[PDB]
Design a protein around this motif. Sequence first.
Motif, PDB file in Angstrom:
ATOM      1  N   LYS A   4       0.853  -0.783   0.300  1.00  0.00           N
ATOM      2  CA  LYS A   4      -0.167   0.211   0.449  1.00  0.00           C
ATOM      3  C   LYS A   4       1.024   0.966  -0.033  1.00  0.00           C
ATOM      4  O   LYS A   4       0.451   2.058  -0.911  1.00  0.00           O
ATOM      5  N   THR A   7       3.074   1.629  -3.367  1.00  0.00           N
ATOM      6  CA  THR A   7       1.998   1.986  -4.464  1.00  0.00           C
ATOM      7  C   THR A   7       1.759   3.770  -4.100  1.00  0.00           C
ATOM      8  O   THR A   7       1.450   4.623  -5.208  1.00  0.00           O
ATOM      9  N   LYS A   8       1.569   3.999  -2.456  1.00  0.00           N
ATOM     10  CA  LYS A   8       1.646   5.708  -2.752  1.00  0.00           C
ATOM     11  C   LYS A   8       2.762   6.389  -3.020  1.00  0.00           C
ATOM     12  O   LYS A   8       2.568   7.437  -3.396  1.00  0.00           O
ATOM     13  N   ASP A  11       2.777   6.275  -6.506  1.00  0.00           N
ATOM     14  CA  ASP A  11       1.532   8.147  -7.275  1.00  0.00           C
ATOM     15  C   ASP A  11       2.716   9.136  -7.008  1.00  0.00           C
ATOM     16  O   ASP A  11       1.979   9.685  -7.500  1.00  0.00           O
ATOM     17  N   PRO A  76      -4.024   5.001 -15.455  1.00  0.00           N
ATOM     18  CA  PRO A  76      -4.577   3.928 -16.081  1.00  0.00           C
ATOM     19  C   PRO A  76      -5.273   3.924 -16.873  1.00  0.00           C
ATOM     20  O   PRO A  76      -5.790   2.464 -16.996  1.00  0.00           O
ATOM     21  N   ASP A  77      -6.136   4.773 -17.281  1.00  0.00           N
ATOM     22  CA  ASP A  77      -7.075   4.370 -18.211  1.00  0.00           C
ATOM     23  C   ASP A  77      -7.537   4.706 -19.393  1.00  0.00           C
ATOM     24  O   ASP A  77      -8.030   3.579 -20.184  1.00  0.00           O
ATOM     25  N   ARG A 106       4.200   1.043 -11.911  1.00  0.00           N
ATOM     26  CA  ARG A 106       2.636   0.724 -10.941  1.00  0.00           C
ATOM     27  C   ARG A 106       1.198   0.729 -11.381  1.00  0.00           C
ATOM     28  O   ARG A 106      -0.142  -0.095 -10.672  1.00  0.00           O
ATOM     29  N   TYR A 107       1.605   0.501 -13.005  1.00  0.00           N
ATOM     30  CA  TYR A 107       0.070   0.287 -13.834  1.00  0.00           C
ATOM     31  C   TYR A 107       0.634  -1.197 -14.756  1.00  0.00           C
ATOM     32  O   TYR A 107       0.089  -0.749 -15.696  1.00  0.00           O
ATOM     33  N   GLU A 109      -0.140  -3.990 -15.501  1.00  0.00           N
ATOM     34  CA  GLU A 109      -1.106  -4.223 -16.306  1.00  0.00           C
ATOM     35  C   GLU A 109      -1.313  -3.282 -17.716  1.00  0.00           C
ATOM     36  O   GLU A 109      -3.024  -4.070 -18.359  1.00  0.00           O
ATOM     37  N   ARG A 110      -0.963  -1.931 -17.571  1.00  0.00           N
ATOM     38  CA  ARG A 110      -1.255  -1.068 -18.058  1.00  0.00           C
ATOM     39  C   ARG A 110      -1.198  -0.685 -19.040  1.00  0.00           C
ATOM     40  O   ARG A 110      -1.487   0.020 -20.248  1.00  0.00           O
TER      41      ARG A 110
ATOM     42  N   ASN B 526     -10.103  -1.320 -18.040  1.00  0.00           N
ATOM     43  CA  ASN B 526     -10.672  -0.424 -17.540  1.00  0.00           C
ATOM     44  C   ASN B 526     -11.776   0.465 -17.186  1.00  0.00           C
ATOM     45  O   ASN B 526     -11.861   0.724 -16.552  1.00  0.00           O
ATOM     46  N   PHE B 529     -12.517  -0.588 -13.086  1.00  0.00           N
ATOM     47  CA  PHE B 529     -12.037  -0.003 -12.648  1.00  0.00           C
ATOM     48  C   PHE B 529     -12.464   1.677 -12.359  1.00  0.00           C
ATOM     49  O   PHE B 529     -11.911   2.051 -11.738  1.00  0.00           O
ATOM     50  N   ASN B 530     -12.633   2.149 -13.692  1.00  0.00           N
ATOM     51  CA  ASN B 530     -12.972   3.664 -13.867  1.00  0.00           C
ATOM     52  C   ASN B 530     -15.072   3.502 -13.058  1.00  0.00           C
ATOM     53  O   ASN B 530     -14.836   4.366 -12.152  1.00  0.00           O
TER      54      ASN B 530
END
Lengths: 299, 580, 432
Positions: A4, A7-8, A11, A76-77, A106-107, A109-110, B526, B529-530
């Motif tokens: 945790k 990850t903070k 970020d 990660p959008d 951090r992402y 999988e993105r 995506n 999680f959004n």
Amino acid sequence: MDEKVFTKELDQWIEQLNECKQLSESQVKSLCEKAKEILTKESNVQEVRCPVTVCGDVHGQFHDLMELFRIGGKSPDTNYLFMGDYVDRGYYSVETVTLLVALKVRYRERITILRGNHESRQITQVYGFYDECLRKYGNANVWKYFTDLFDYLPLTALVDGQIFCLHGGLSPSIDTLDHIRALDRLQEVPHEGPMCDLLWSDPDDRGGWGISPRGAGYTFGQDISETFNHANGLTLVSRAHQLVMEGYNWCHDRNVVTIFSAPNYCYRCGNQAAIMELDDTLKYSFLQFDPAPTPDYFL
Amino acid sequence: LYPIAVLIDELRNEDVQLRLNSIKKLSTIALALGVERTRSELLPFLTDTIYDEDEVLLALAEQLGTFTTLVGGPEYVHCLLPPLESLATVEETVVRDKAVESLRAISHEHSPSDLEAHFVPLVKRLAGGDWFTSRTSACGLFSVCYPRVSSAVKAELRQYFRNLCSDDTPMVRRAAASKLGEFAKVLELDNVKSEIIPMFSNLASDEQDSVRLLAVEACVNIAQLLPQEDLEALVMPTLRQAAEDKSWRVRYMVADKFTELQKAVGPEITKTDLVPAFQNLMKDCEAEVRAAASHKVKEFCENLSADCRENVIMSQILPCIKELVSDANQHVKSALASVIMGLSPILGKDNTIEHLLPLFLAQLKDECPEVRLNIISNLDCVNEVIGIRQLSQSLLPAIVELAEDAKWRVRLAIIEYMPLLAGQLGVEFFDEKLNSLCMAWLVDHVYAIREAATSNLKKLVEKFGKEWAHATIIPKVLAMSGDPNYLHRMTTLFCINVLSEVCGQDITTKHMLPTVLRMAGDPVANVRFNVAKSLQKIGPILDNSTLQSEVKPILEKLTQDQDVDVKYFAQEALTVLSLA
Amino acid sequence: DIQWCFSQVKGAVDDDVAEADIISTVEFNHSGELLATGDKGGRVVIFQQEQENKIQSHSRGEYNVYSTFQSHEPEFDYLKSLEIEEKINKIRWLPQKNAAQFLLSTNDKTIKLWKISERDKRPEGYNLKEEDGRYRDPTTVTTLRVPVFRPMDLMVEASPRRIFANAHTYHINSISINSDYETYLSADDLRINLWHLEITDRSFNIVDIKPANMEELTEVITAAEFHPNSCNTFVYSSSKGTIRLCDMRASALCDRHSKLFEEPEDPSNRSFFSEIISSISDVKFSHSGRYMMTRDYLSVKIWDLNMENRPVETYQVHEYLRSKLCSLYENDCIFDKFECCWNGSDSVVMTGSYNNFFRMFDRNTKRDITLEASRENNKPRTVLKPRKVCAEISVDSLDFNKKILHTAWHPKENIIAVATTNNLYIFQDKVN
């Protein structure tokens, strides 16, 4: 617990990097260690699922990369897939590469940061990454950890098994994807062989294999790409590493596509940038973005 | 103790970074050594130490400025002079500038006797040296010791400065021209007219155009010291020769400083001489001079004489602006467009509609993105002065046609302008024409435009109320949830997030909540999680019953998904909502 | 008569040398007390004149070695897979800022600003360690002592200050310092960049002659010199004989030359080499700036800055090779780039030639003299005869490899430095 707070910290590091501010030597050390720990499990061909937003050369341009993130969305959008050249003749190469590596950590999988030709100890010393790193840090430490992190970056990527994304081009010694799998990428790029050509090759207009104008790697004609596509059962070979005026270009009768995403490259060519967006309908939607908002002595 | 000795040894080290760190911590070294030891053996080590690089010498020069308290106060500060005199001679201009700045800073601690005995001789030594770097550094040390010395020393300093301005190396003259305005501020008015005016006129006609383009700033700083009657005979001829200069750099500097010139010379001299000068600068054959002159158009026209402000504007400046609008250079148009709109209140409504409106239309339909971007950025200035009943007939078609143009920065500018624009038009008419525009912005192929249209939708809702959103806006927002491109589903989620806080509790519960809950089963992680992020954002406004009954099972179900991101963003959604 | 006597020579101990000691440029200081010679390999050697005491006058000072440093190390550009040559192209001495000495040395891609400073004092002492580097325990030291600068033997050190790189995609051939002490130009084959002497990240390109299609190359820049007095005027030659005199007062981008110095060609005066032997090798402005010099392969032309269509004075250097230009085209020896130099008072002009020869035309007396730069036939306390050619020594007896491609002249004296293939020769007139 530890995950945790880590990850903070990640970020916060991404948030600070977004403000053009670099990281500290210890932070770069920890980031490179974690990124290597993550990337050691990624194969030579990283199978990535749709939807994805295939980007190309960034070349250290950090405000231009921020423009890229403003066109296709933020992580990660938006699922991204970068293919090489985050350093080397960018005025903010360290921030670009640090942001991309932090996003990958951090992402995981993105993002999918591939390996380019300007990602090696040889290239990073002459074309303004070692010099910029010394200017911004005063020592060859964080440069060293960046370059030996560059070792574990994947060589290729397979989008849904139909889009073959690599930074360079096809190899004379490679016919199928399994040959790329058999390669040992846990080393610096060689001066010859399959691994060098997977990052240094270029598509040309004449058929058959040819000699590269850059002296490194080979060139492949339309029939090489056609044979590779019909043998591997995939519909498109995505690539980068070549400057294209319109940002993106189609070659070999819509068999491969060059996506160069660094606009105003060389500051006098005036080229635009492009990114390639994929959905589960596999529609290729190419976005473009040129901008990013006498000399003083002669003013 | 031991670290301080490490620092002392570290001043002499092969590592540049370690030496720089040791020099940056010179205050602790001096504190440990003591005032007498620093005056006797630390500082003399720092005078011969000039063997370093740019950063080390720059740090040493910066440190020596704040050393006057560590050597024994303002009485022994003269012992700080040799190291700074040595640093002012180095080749690096940043090190020289910082050495000059530190010499000036410690020059305020010199008593007048100590001044004339130690610092004035230092200025003479620097200004009479054989190295032109010493004289370049001495040019900036005449304004800090002049007002505190005797008349004889003042005369000697004036003579030395006059010799500096008449030097043979262009760098010394170019450095004296920069400090001519500063030196003239501490002189006497009779002395100004007798000595600086010949100096300023001689520097303004220099053989080097790099020294001529500093006489413009010299003129700006000098015209503020002379009476209004003496400007015509002493300063104005040289300014006229500088506006009509042969080198484009001098004309560019005049155009750049034109507003300050107009402020300094007084309105009558402006209306008489500068207005023809401004016209001739805006018709210059040089693109950069034209751009610089057009940058100042609105400011110059605003600061004109109030007796005939609009009259002289319309008579003289307006034709040249009409010519600049049709210019063949991108920068000139882009610079005039960002400043032309402010001219509207000065001329009034009728003059605006008659003359400026065709220019505004021609610049909105300009092929250059920057012209349109700047015009839309400054449209509020004319919108306030010509009202809303007259704006729409001539301006609204341009905005509607340009809200769909290629460059997304222009679309973003229109999006930012849209809430303020539509606020004055009411809900009844905005719905008919611009609601479709604001909805088509949400589907734009640029995420920046989608986010901008989302924020603009919030602003429109907060301006027009919640009933209009519930009737005509929200259904259209949920219509995008079935888009085959998942970026647009994320856009629907973003719109619901920015509309939850402003559209209302019961409406959020009854209309947009079901779609947010349903979209949790999207086959793209995506969107999953959004949806988690959207539920976390929206949770605070929901009541307990709907939350714990429907949101909790759906959000919890996201915590069994294979993707790590969905798991994490649902986990730090249950805890922030205190649902765990 | 003016007697030119051998003064100094620098060369290898043996007679076998490689392509790392061939002298590539020679340029005196502004005051003439220094002399840099950046031979190929990036090895710059600085020769300081022996200090002339104000009491002794029976002998003038010679040029002894004063400093030596590697200006450019071998480099390899990976994106094109060729080797960046380490050869030093042009050395330009900046005017003296302080006691240090500056010069711009350029290879084919980069320009460096070196600082030749002198050290005569070094720090002696340590708090923890000893005066030789052996560490000591901190348990025996309690008082802090600071180092003291003690005098030491003179040592000369050169350190690069600024590097101006990554702005020229072609071979940099010339640089020139502007007469404003803050900027200079660098000219490659097809464009000219104007740099600031303290801004290394940006170069304002003021001249571009690159055609849209590279297959139609009709002109390449072969030299570019600023004006000694004007802050803005600068001239640049080309390979077709054109001599463009730009004037940066007019516009920011210098797309239009203010003047174009050119001699109109006529069919009656040309047979086959109108386009080849007309390329300007180097253009030198007169010290007063009134006149200008341009040296092509066979003729020296002195243009007046007002007359833009005819050279005021024409001098033929090796016109006795005109019968053998065809033989010079097959061995690739006609593409030599000779360099010309002006007198200290713009009264005599001198330029190199083949077989250790370099001619000296007198502007006023119209008398020319051809001297020889050799040491195997010159002895101490022996006069030197002015060599002569037959147009005696035959034309086939000229060693076309022992060429003089680089020359320099003292600013305020009569000392000229002539650099041969390997050995640097310094000539100095004898005044009794």
